[PDB]
Design a protein around this ligand. Structure first.
Ligand SMILES: CC[C@@H]1c2c(C#N)ncn2-c2cnc(Nc3ccc(C(=O)NC4CCN(C)CC4)cc3OC)nc2N1C1CCCC1
Ligand SMILES: [Zn+2]
Length: 294
C-alpha cells in the first residue's frame, strides 16, 4: 500500500514536520496539517506519492509547479515554505490558510454583498498583478484556489497549471489541465497568455456577485460551447458599474479585456465602498456595514 510517514524529515534543511489533521485530496495529493518540530509552526503539507509520478511528463509539471511557486512571495499569494522527497513521496510545505477558500465561502453564502466582492476581488487582483509582473500566468484562478487566512485575506494558491512567460508576446499553445473558468482562446486552441487570468477573474467576480458561475450548464462541453459563443447574461439586480466591469473582462477577444493593472482603477473599485477588513461573521452572515454599533 505504501504508507505516508507520521513524521516528514527534510534531510537537507534538517527540519522535521509532524503530520497532523488530514485536510483532503488535491489531485494526486493527500493534504495534511503539518507542524515543525523545533518551531511548532503549522503548515499545509501536500503529499503526493511517486507511484503516481511514473511518467516524466507528470514529474515535469510538478517540478515546474515548485520552480514557479518557490520564486514567488506576496501578501496575496500562498507562502511557499519548501519541498522535499524520500523515495516514495513528494512533500510540499505551504502556508496554512485556516479559513479554507472562497469556494467554501461561496457554498455557505452564495452571492456576496458588493463591498465584500470588492474586498475579495481587490486582493485577488493585487495577487495577480504581482504574478503578471513576475511573468507568471496562473491559468486556473477559481474559488477553490483562492484561500483565506485567519484575517480573511485572499491567498492565491495551486500553481499546478501555472506557466512562466519567457519572452515578450509569447502565445502559449498548450495548457495541460482543465481550468474551471477556462478562457475561449484556450478552448479554441488559438494560443493564450495573461488575459486568461483576467477572464477567470471576470468569472469569479460574476460568481461572487450572482451566486452562480456565468457559463454553468449540466454538461461541461455545453458549457465550453457557451464560452465560445460568449453566451452568458447578467441578472438585472446586479449594479451596472459592476456589470460593466464583468462585461469588459468576459469578452471573447483577449485583447479587448483590461490588463490586470487597469482593474483597480475601474469605477467598480474607485467609486464603491471597499472594506479595510471583514469580520469572521462574514463566513456565515451577510454584512450590513453599519456606521456605528448598538
Ligand atoms: C495544501 C493543499 C491546498 C493548498 C494549496 C495548494 N495547492 N495552497 C494552499 N493550500 C491550503 C492552505 N490551507 C488549507 N487549509 C485547510 C483546508 C481544509 C480544511 C478542512 O477543514 N478540511 C476538512 C474538509 C472536510 N473533511 C470531511 C474533513 C477535513 C482546513 C484547512 O485549514 C485549517 N488548505 C489548503 N489546500 C487544501 C485544498 C484541499 C485540501 C487542502
Ligand atoms: Zn500533458
Amino acid at each position: 500500500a505504501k504508507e505516508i510517514p507520521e513524521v516528514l524529515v527534510d534531510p537537507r534543511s534538517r527540519r522535521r514536520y509532524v503530520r497532523g489533521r488530514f485536510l483532503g485530496k488535491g489531485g494526486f495529493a493527500k493534504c495534511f496539517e503539518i507542524s515543525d518540530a523545533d518551531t511548532k509552526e503549522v503548515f499545509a503539507g501536500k503529499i503526493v506519492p511517486k507511484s503516481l509520478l511514473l511518467k516524466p511528463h507528470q514529474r515535469e509539471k510538478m517540478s515546474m509547479e515548485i520552480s514557479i511557486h518557490r520564486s514567488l512571495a506576496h501578501q496575496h499569494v500562498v507562502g511557499f515554505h519548501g519541498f522535499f522527497e524520500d523515495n516514495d513521496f513528494v512533500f510540499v510545505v505551504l502556508e496554512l490558510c485556516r479559513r479554507r477558500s472562497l469556494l467554501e465561502l461561496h457554498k455557505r453564502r452564495k452571492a456576496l454583498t458588493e463591498p465584500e466582492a470588492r474586498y475579495y476581488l481587490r486582493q485577488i487582483v493585487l495577487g495577480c498583478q504581482y504574478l503578471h509582473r513576475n511573468r507568471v500566468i496562473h491559468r486556473d484562478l477559481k474559488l477553490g484556489n483562492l484561500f483565506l487566512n485567519e484575517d480573511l485575506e485572499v491567498k492565491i494558491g495551486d500553481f499546478g497549471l501555472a506557466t512562466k512567460v519567457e519572452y515578450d508576446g509569447e502565445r502559449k499553445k498548450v495548457l495541460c489541465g482543465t481550468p474551471n473558468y477556462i478562457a475561449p482562446e484556450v478552448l479554441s486552441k488559438k494560443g493564450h497568455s495573461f488575459e486568461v487570468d483576467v477572464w477567470s477573474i471576470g468569472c469569479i467576480m460574476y460568481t461572487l456577485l450572482v451566486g452562480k458561475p456565468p457559463f454553468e450548464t449540466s454538461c461541461l462541453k455545453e458549457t465550453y460551447l457557451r464560452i465560445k459563443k460568449n453566451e452568458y447574461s447578467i441578472p438585472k439586480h446586479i449594479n451596472p458599474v459592476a456589470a460593466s466591469l464583468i462585461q469588459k473582462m468576459l469578452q471573447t477577444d483577449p485583447t479587448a479585456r483590461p490588463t490586470i493593472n487597469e482593474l483597480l482603477n475601474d469605477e467598480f473599485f474607485t467609486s464603491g465602498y471597499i472594506p479595510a477588513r471583514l469580520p469572521i461573521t462574514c463566513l456565515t452572515i451577510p454584512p450590513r456595514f453599519s456606521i456605528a454599533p448598538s
